[PDB]
Design a protein around this nucleic acid. Structure first.
Ligand SMILES: [Mg+2]
Ligand SMILES: [Mg+2]
Ligand SMILES: [Mg+2]
Ligand SMILES: [Mg+2]
Ligand SMILES: [Mg+2]
Ligand SMILES: [Mg+2]
Ligand SMILES: [Mg+2]
Ligand SMILES: [Mg+2]
Ligand SMILES: [Mg+2]
Ligand SMILES: [Mg+2]
Ligand SMILES: [Mg+2]
Lengths: 136, 190, 106, 197, 172
RNA sequence: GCAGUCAAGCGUUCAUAGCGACAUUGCUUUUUGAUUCUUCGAUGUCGGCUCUUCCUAUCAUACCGAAGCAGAAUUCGGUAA
RNA sequence: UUUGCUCCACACAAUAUAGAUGGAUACGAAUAAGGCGUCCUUGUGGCGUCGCUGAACCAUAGCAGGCUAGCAACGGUGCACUUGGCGGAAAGGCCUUGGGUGCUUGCUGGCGAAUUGCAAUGUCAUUUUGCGUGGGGAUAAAUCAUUUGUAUACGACUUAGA
């Protein structure tokens, strides 16, 4: 006797929404939405990661699931204060998204001897995995 | 003008389960069940407190948020049709030839036949949509009552029974003859 | 190893052309994995071979080679320009060429 | 990057998919397009039906068996789209169209092969939400294609067998992922995680 | 016109013997560069006063940067443009962080909605609306609501490859 | 030749059921004027007969909308070759 | 019946190549929604989780990958043979059973490589064919000419004849 409505989980464009710049000079750095200009334009500010306070489109921008409590139009010192108080970078680096960015950077930063060691170790782990697959 | 966020307010009474998946609404009440497929609209349904469901359009134009109140009225019609039901009463209007309307059975299909419409030898058959039940009112002369859970089914079956009795090649301002909807209402209403 | 490849696959797309006039002296090569002219700047100067086969055996081999090199980049999407010693035969618009890693600077 | 590329034509727009596929065939890539009867065209069904009737009304006046052959099947509607994006009167164009196979449904061998999508052509990525679109199977049946029901019955059977396969595959993937997550917190797994794997 | 640049342009109407020290008329000009800025200065001073380039001089041209380029501001823009069949005045409102970005939005807005080219348009005034509820247009009053948040439905992700193997999802 | 816009007025009253002055804006190449661009080292020159196809600006037939459509008969119009 | 024809295996030639050079790596559906895992009252359920690209996953060390000695394990994989089931949309493939027979880089060893001389695709694929060897299999028609007239300008059609 209960109504059941699916309630699609969207990352909102809100003040304090932590975003990830994907295009431009920052390009992989986090910032915080500080004000909303229009539907397509926001004012972000990324003071710990080095992003300047700027008006950016929401098309150079990926909203992350992270949100910290930030007042609207907060200047850069306030944004850095609330950011470091709410520990945005520590909460970001624990996510499976930032671990995937770090993993693909590490994989691209592998050398040839490290790729050889990856092959040797993958065969070694494969032996135990395929051995236990038959038993279980 | 691209409105930021428009909201409408579907109120859910007691005994009524409005379960909404993607855009397939299922309303179950004391009278039965109704299912609508609203996958052509692009709205977002959110349940608030089991007696209220908001429906929303984010970044919608005028023609898009025009459909939001249509959706709210459609789910409200489902709720009203499974709580109070729907009941459309039609009257037979004739000048000389009495319109003989019966309910007939044709290989398990439940037609309404209309004989002697303007002295026609043609028998006008209107199938009965499922969910719609037909009765003929005692103590009200020449009244047929179409009632059911669905306002769309009931009102379209009433419209079909009206449109089968249209007058051809005559001045329809004088030949006013047919079956017309005289009342739209609910089954258990007071 | 099941793979012995020491080159990067490419496709001979077409000759250099305008809408209606082609230049057979310059060929366009789509190198696999290159999607940017800045990526294509790695392969500039690298030797291209178009390796094909015949029936007549000329020097103890039924396999013949057309040699050339990447000269510059073409466009915005990693297509490069190649020049060959003898031009590519234009029945190979869509054939595979091999872009070797020599002369290597990396 | 594959020897042939099997493209699931469901949810794609016909001209965008055909402009992708034409350039790939001319670049030398062999392409199969399966499920051509779920291809979308932008614009409503009546608009596209009127466009096909405009195509249908034009044939050679003195002998209709010479004119524009109005092919009715969705695969041949897509192939008509893709010709005219290929320079088909030349040997290079004929050789490029010999690299293409377009099918209704997913027939044999391609039923047991991986089907890819082309996101530059996908309707959910290209059309504005709320824009009307048609489906190639409905359009073909309205203009005279005779096997919409046969393809639907065979596709339902194909979907049943592929769902049985995927239930077995999920059981095996559960076993493999359980064996791999057991292998984590080992020395080899930690050394691979240090190298990014 | 990638972004516009606002210039003060001060010009004089060349000093004669009867009148030395002339009057120094000054304007604020949105232009791509100083060439267009001096040209627009003479275009508007030929509309206001009896002077042209031959009988005047430019004494100064300075770019006016935005005083707070990272504060989101509501601008009222009074504009006069030439339609196909007349001349009209408009008042539009643009929310942006700087006057030059607001004027770029205005020029795109006018060319889009009213088909008005750069030559047709005179920027009569750009002034920041200092307080809300003097803001007059609904399309900018939307964003001045308290605790405004909105989602971005139907995310379309740009793929770098011509083939995908996943049947992508438009969640966000 | 055929349409359209405005509407003083005709239509017992009533501009627009049906017409519609004074103006005004167009369509078509099925008439005729205008050109002399192709043909003067032959494009056989009207009409008819025969036979095929096409257009719709629909006379009839099918289905309808409007009337100063009671019925009958008409009149205006739509889809429609 | 100048021992014809066809199939399988290997050997040698000729023939070419719309263009191999680790692997085409299989749910369906929705996108204003889903995938996976788990739990229960098995649902349009609860909880967790993931995406933000395949930049993945699998494979991948060895004279183009030789010979040989062990340790650990009873796994992985190739080859033929074999048991059973499924697949007709173009099935001609998918999944299994048992033994044999290699290989194993899961771990530790021994020997070899050179001189293709500073690079020359430095030849490793899969199509058709022929010829030859040794193992099977089968033992017809059609056309002309004669004839019919259900056909016909001629062909063609349609009939008949040991
Ligand atoms: Mg009458
Ligand atoms: Mg070309
Ligand atoms: Mg698939
Ligand atoms: Mg037919
Ligand atoms: Mg002559
Ligand atoms: Mg002659
Ligand atoms: Mg002649
Ligand atoms: Mg007409
Ligand atoms: Mg008519
Ligand atoms: Mg016609
Ligand atoms: Mg090996």
């Amino acid at each position: 006797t209960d109504s059941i409505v699916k309630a699609s989980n969207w990352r909102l464009v809100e003040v304090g929404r932590v975003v990830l710049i994907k295009k431009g000079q920052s390009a992989g750095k986090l910032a915080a939405i500080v004000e909303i200009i229009d539907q397509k334009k926001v004012l972000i500010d990324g003071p710990k990661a080095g992003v300047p306070r700027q008006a950016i489109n929401l098309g150079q921008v990926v909203l992350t699931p992270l949100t910290f409590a930030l007042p609207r139009g907060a200047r850069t010192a306030t944004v850095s204060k609330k950011w470091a108080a709410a520990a945005v970078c520590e909460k970001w680096a624990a996510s499976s998204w930032a671990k995937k960015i770090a993993q693909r950077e590490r994989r691209a930063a592998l050398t040839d001897f490290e790729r050889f060691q990856v092959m040797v170790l993958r065969k070694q782990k494969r032996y135990t995995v395929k051995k236990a697959l038959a038993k279980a | 003008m691209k409105y930021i966020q428009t909201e409408q307010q579907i109120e859910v009474p007691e005994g009524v389960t409005v379960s909404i998946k993607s855009r397939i609404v299922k309303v179950v009440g004391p009278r039965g069940t109704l299912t609508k497929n609203l996958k052509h609209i692009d709205v977002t349904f959110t349940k608030v407190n089991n007696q209220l469901i908001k429906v929303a359009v984010h970044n919608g134009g005028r023609k898009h948020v025009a459909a939001l109140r249509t959706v709210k009225s459609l789910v409200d019609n489902m709720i009203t049709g499974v709580t109070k039901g729907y009941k459309y009463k039609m009257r037979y209007v004739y000048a000389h030839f009495p319109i003989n309307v019966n309910i007939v059975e044709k290989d398990g299909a439940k037609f309404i036949e209309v004989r002697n419409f303007l002295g026609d030898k043609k028998i006008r058959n209107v199938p009965v949509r499922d969910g719609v039940t037909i009765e003929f009112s005692t103590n009200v002369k020449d009244e047929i009552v179409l009632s059911g859970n669905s306002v769309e089914d009931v009102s379209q079956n009433a419209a079909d029974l009206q449109q089968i009795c249209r007058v051809r090649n005559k001045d329809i301002r004088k030949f006013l003859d047919g079956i017309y909807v005289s009342h739209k209402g609910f089954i258990t209403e007071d | 190893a099941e793979s012995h490849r020491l080159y990067v696959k490419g496709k001979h797309l077409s000759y250099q052309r305008s809408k209606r006039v082609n230049n057979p002296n310059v060929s366009l090569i789509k190198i696999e994995g290159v999607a940017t002219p800045q990526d294509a700047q790695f392969y500039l100067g690298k030797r291209i071979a178009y390796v094909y086969r015949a029936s007549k055996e000329v020097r103890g081999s039924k396999i013949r080679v057309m040699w050339g090199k990447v000269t510059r980049t073409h466009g915005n999407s990693g297509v490069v320009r190649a020049t060959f010693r003898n031009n590519l035969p234009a029945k190979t618009f869509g054939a595979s060429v091999r872009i070797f890693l020599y002369p290597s600077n990396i | 990057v594959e020897p042939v590329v099997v493209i699931d034509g469901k949810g794609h727009l016909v001209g965008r998919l055909a402009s992708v596929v034409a350039k790939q065939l001319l670049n030398g890539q062999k392409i199969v397009v399966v499920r051509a009867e779920e291809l979308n065209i932008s614009g409503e069904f009546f608009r596209n039906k009127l466009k096909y009737h405009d195509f249908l009304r034009k044939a050679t006046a003195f002998n209709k068996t010479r004119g524009p052959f109005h092919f009715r099947a969705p695969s041949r509607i897509f192939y008509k789209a893709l010709r005219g994006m290929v320079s088909h009167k030349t040997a290079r164009g004929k050789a490029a169209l010999e690299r293409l196979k377009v099918f209704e449904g997913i027939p044999p061998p391609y039923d047991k092969k991986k089907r890819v999508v082309v996101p530059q052509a996908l309707r959910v990525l290209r059309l504005k939400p709320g824009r009307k679109y048609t489906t190639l199977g409905k359009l073909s049946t309205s203009v005279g294609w005779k096997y919409e029901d046969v393809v639907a019955k065979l596709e339902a059977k194909r979907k049943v067998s592929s769902a049985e396969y995927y239930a077995k595959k999920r059981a095996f993937t559960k076993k493999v992922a359980s064996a791999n997550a057991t292998a984590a917190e080992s020395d080899v797994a930690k050394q691979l995680a240090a190298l990014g794997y | 016109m990638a972004h516009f640049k606002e210039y003060q342009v001060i010009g004089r109407r060349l000093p004669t013997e009867s009148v030395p020290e002339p009057k120094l008329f000054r304007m604020r000009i949105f232009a791509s560069n100083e060439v267009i800025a001096k040209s627009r200065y003479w275009y508007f001073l030929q509309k206001l006063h009896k002077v042209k380039k031959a009988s005047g001089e430019i004494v100064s041209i300075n770019q006016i940067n935005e005083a707070h380029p990272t504060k989101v501001k509501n601008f009222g823009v009074w504009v006069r443009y030439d339609s196909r069949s007349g001349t009209h005045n408009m008042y539009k409102e643009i929310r942006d962080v700087s006057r030059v970005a607001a004027v770029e939005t205005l020029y795109q807005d006018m060319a889009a909605r009213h088909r008005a080219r750069f030559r047709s348009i005179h920027i009569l005034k750009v002034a920041e609306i200092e307080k809300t509820a003097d803001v007059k247009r609904q399309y900018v009053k939307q964003f001045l609501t308290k605790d405004l948040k909105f989602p971005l439905p139907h995310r379309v992700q740009k793929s770098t490859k011509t083939f995908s193997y996943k049947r992508p999802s438009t969640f966000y």
